[PDB]
């Protein structure tokens, strides 16, 4: 299902889905890889 690419938004993280960037909540996304603090991390929705 849809793959997200979130970073901290400067509880909620600023994501991208595949050229549009959508803002999400920490709880409804699920880490696919190790989360990185400064840069981006790839998540996937709790819906799948």
């Amino acid at each position: 299902c849809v793959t997200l690419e979130c970073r901290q938004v400067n509880e909620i993280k600023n994501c991208s889905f595949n050229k549009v960037y959508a803002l999400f909540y920490r709880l409804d996304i699920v880490p696919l890889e190790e989360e990185r603090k400064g840069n981006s991390s790839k998540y996937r929705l709790i819906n799948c």
Epitope: P31, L32, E34, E35, R36, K37, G38
Partner: antibody, heavy 121, light 108 residues
């Protein structure tokens, strides 16, 4: 039960390419981080790089200057490293290790025994 | 890069003494820190992985503390099996950087 084993020539002529492989048992390379770490004789630990299959991702320590390559072989469940244009600075004991993760957290929970690779003519 | 500095370089203590290894980062690393034990001739083995959380099978004598930049490994009752060099590692940001080691030996 989960164990790792580095294999490869312990001698590399300089300016040539080190090659090692880590055979993995009791776990599948498909689900965690698999990295290489080296340790020159009587000195500390340097992380080389990791590989990860859920997102098909490799990271490399910039200290290797793009001489390092990490290959995965899901077929035989072993992953390999190559290091090109080696110099004596690449003489070290090379560890493969499995890296677990949770949230922002990461660690090497099991290590191979390690193989020494002398770079010499 | 994040520089990682352990102190001291070396230490000797009596069996049953308490010993603490310090590891200091050059930035705050939000407890993304793991401690490893490397007995001579062996590969390192994991002790602690999220500043505080002790790995299963590791002895209750090993404890992990710290926040921000400053982090400690404390050996409650130094046993003779603890002869090793101990390594901290930060996973806050790649490239993940190891401490320079702290060698622990027994005063007997």
């Amino acid at each position: 039960q989960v164990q790792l084993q580095e294999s490869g020539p312990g001698l590399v002529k300089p300016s040539e390419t080190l090659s090692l492989t880590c055979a993995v048992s009791g776990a599948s390379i498909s689900s965690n981080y698999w990295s290489w770490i080296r340790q020159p004789p009587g000195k500390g630990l340097e992380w080389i790089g990791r590989i990860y299959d859920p997102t098909d991702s490799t990271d490399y320590n910039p200290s290797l200057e793009s001489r390092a390559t990490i290959s995965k072989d899901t077929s035989k469940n072993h992953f390999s490293l190559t290091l090109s244009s080696v110099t004596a600075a690449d003489t070290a004991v090379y560890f493969c290790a499995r890296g677990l993760w949770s949230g922002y957290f990461f660690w090497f929970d099991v290590w191979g025994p390690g193989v020494l690779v002398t770079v010499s003519s | 890069d994040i520089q990682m500095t352990q102190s001291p370089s070396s230490l000797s203590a009596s069996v049953g003494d308490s010993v603490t290894v310090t590891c200091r980062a050059s930035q705050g690393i939000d407890k993304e820190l793991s401690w490893y034990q490397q007995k001579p001739g062996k590969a390192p083995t994991l002790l602690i992985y999220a500043a505080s959380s002790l790995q299963t099978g590791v002895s209750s004598r090993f404890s992990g503390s710290g926040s921000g930049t400053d982090y400690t490994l404390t050996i409650s009752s130094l046993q003779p099996e603890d002869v090793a060099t101990y390594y901290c590692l930060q996973d806050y940001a790649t490239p993940y950087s190891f401490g320079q080691g702290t060698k622990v030996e027994i005063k007997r």
